[PDB]
Design a protein around this nucleic acid. Structure first.
Ligand SMILES: [Mg+2]
Ligand SMILES: [Mg+2]
Length: 540
DNA sequence: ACCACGGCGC
DNA sequence: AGGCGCCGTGGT
């Protein structure tokens, strides 16, 4: 019943804190408190009081550690019931949600957050009793990873502001050309960013066929699915798509980046979240690195903005084909495993297995087919979309999917076994036992059920790839710290480091070894490494 | 400002 | 290929 004692707290208290805004690097610490045995201790001066703690334990511990690091304090994050909640069920992604689900309330008062953290931790710890695989993940991956991520977020990355000015101008110049042409074809200016105004132009004024409908507003859609089907019905459609692409790039990944350069540090502090996704993959925000375009040369132009400090270099490491390697491991398909053991081009081999021709006879269009099939099958691409993407009949798409499963029958078996297990147990799991609940496999609606089926056989693969990277980051960090090198960015299956140019080569060698050897699979883990003054130069 | 929403990236 | 972070719009 509310025992309130003075600051400082006994060792092993849980902390609660309130920030002026959600982003710790940019926030003022408004209040700080700790709780132990349900006894709450409120700090009189929060920043001063941070020096009394030896670690941050509690909800959003990593975020307090980032802010402490900004302030020159080494306050590592430790136990956090968010990590436990996320292990129990990855739909647990926010403190508000976790309190709602398991008891208590996420409020705006630091003492209450401290008390909540303590009770939630005990509760969730009990709920994990006997779950040895999740507990292994907590101890070997999640808790130690949180300290790595704190350092990554607090360190940040240098941007090339002169380059971004030049890129901005170039893109602005092309947007203006496209804009003028859309208006010339429409016969009058209008707001190209307004889908409502664009709907009226395309379908009422120009009279084009309206295929699809919006999802909730019930109007004629102007989505790329519609426009693609009309790219010939009128030249304005192609210009709209080009304009949309550039404006999305500019407004998302050019215009906002310089404003994200911190006044104190001179660096951009991408935020990393380890309890955000269905699969266990790390997420980033401000900016979201995952959605920098990867197909287009546009994406490359953004990566070029990320540069090393003067006298340093960036080292970029990528797990080549890790999703397919994991699929090979999980399915045990001996044909797929052989491709990788033999160190062969996986798409050329797939093509040559698929088509029963020698690898020398595989032409680029065949390799493109194999590549699309490889990932189509992984991601649950339909025959209809496959037929669009390769520009072949629908029946030929169907045949090509069946040819793949004939060649890789244990991949077919594994997908069906995985769906059966998910339907039986209500969840699927990764190699390490990270678990995702999949209730909608029972869904009545075809669309919703099929989405659940894709999640069911994607999560084991994606989440194994995720935890391999996360384990590798945990293993690598202490070794980099000792070389005076640092971890900066993680996205997809890639890790970006920064090191003094004198030690960049040795750092690369060390990181490649650690990542390739993180865990033994039925196939080799292969890491592509590059070194450069900017991220584009390092990963090309 | 707040919100839901279309649209789009992965 | 395939839940959500992101942008700008239009409503209040
Ligand atoms: Mg685009
Ligand atoms: Mg929405």
């Amino acid at each position: 019943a509310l025992e309130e004692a003075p600051w400082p707290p006994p060792e092993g208290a849980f902390v609660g804190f309130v920030l002026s805004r959600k982003e710790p690097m940019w926030a003022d610490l408004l209040a700080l408190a700790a709780a132990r045995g349900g006894r709450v201790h409120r700090a009189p001066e929060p920043y001063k009081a941070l020096r009394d703690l030896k670690e941050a334990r509690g909800l959003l511990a990593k975020d307090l550690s980032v802010l402490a690091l900004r302030e020159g304090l080494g306050l590592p994050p430790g136990d956090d019931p968010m990590l436990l909640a996320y292990l129990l069920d990855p739909s647990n992604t926010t403190p508000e949600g976790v309190a709602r689900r398991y008891g208590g309330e996420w409020t705006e008062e630091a003492g209450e957050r401290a008390a909540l953290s303590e009770r939630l931790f005990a509760n969730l710890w009990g709920r994990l009793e006997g779950e040895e695989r999740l507990l292994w993940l907590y101890r070997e991956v999640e808790r130690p990873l949180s300290a790595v991520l704190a350092h990554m977020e607090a360190t940040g990355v240098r941007l090339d502001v002169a380059y971004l000015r030049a890129l901005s101008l170039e893109v602005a110049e092309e947007i203006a050309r496209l804009e003028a042409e859309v208006f010339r074809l429409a016969g009058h200016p209008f707001n190209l960013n307004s889908r409502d105004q664009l709907e009226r132009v395309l379908f009422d004024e120009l009279g084009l066929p309206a295929i699809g409908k919006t999802e909730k507003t019930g109007k004629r859609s102007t989505s790329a699915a519609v426009l693609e089907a009309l790219r010939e019905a009128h030249p304005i459609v192609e210009k709209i798509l080009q304009y949309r692409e550039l404006t999305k790039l500019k407004s998302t990944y050019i215009d906002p980046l310089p404003d994200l350069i911190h006044p104190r540090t001179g660096r951009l502090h991408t935020r990393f979240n380890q309890t955000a996704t269905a699969t266990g993959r790390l997420s980033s925000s401000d900016p979201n690195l995952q959605n920098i375009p990867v197909r287009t040369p546009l994406g490359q132009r953004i990566r070029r903005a990320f540069i090393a400090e003067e006298g340093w270099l960036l080292v970029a490491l990528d797990y080549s084909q890790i999703e397919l390697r994991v699929l090979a491991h999980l399915s045990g398909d001996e044909n797929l495993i052989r491709v990788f053991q033999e160190g062969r081009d996986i798409h050329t081999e797939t093509a040559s297995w698929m088509f029963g021709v020698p690898r020398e006879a595989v032409d680029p269009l065949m390799r493109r087919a194999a590549k699309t099939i490889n990932f189509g099958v992984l991601y649950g691409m339909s025959a209809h979309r496959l037929s669009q993407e390769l520009a072949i009949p629908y029946e030929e798409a169907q045949a090509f999917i069946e040819r793949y499963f004939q060649s890789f029958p244990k991949v077919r078996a594994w997908i069906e076994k995985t769906l059966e297990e998910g339907r039986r147990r209500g969840y699927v799991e990764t190699l390490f036992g990270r678990r995702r609940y999949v209730p909608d496999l029972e869904a009545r609606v075809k669309s919703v059920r099929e989405a659940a089926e894709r999640m069911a056989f994607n999560m084991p693969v994606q989440g194994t790839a995720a935890d391999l990277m996360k384990l590798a980051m945990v293993k690598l960090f202490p070794r980099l710290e000792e070389m005076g090198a640092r971890m900066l960015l993680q996205v997809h299956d890639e890790l970006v480091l920064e090191a003094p140019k004198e030690r960049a080569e040795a750092v690369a060698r060390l990181a490649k070894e650690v990542m390739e050897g993180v865990y033994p699979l039925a196939v080799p883990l292969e890491v592509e490494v590059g070194i450069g003054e900017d991220w584009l130069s390092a990963k090309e």
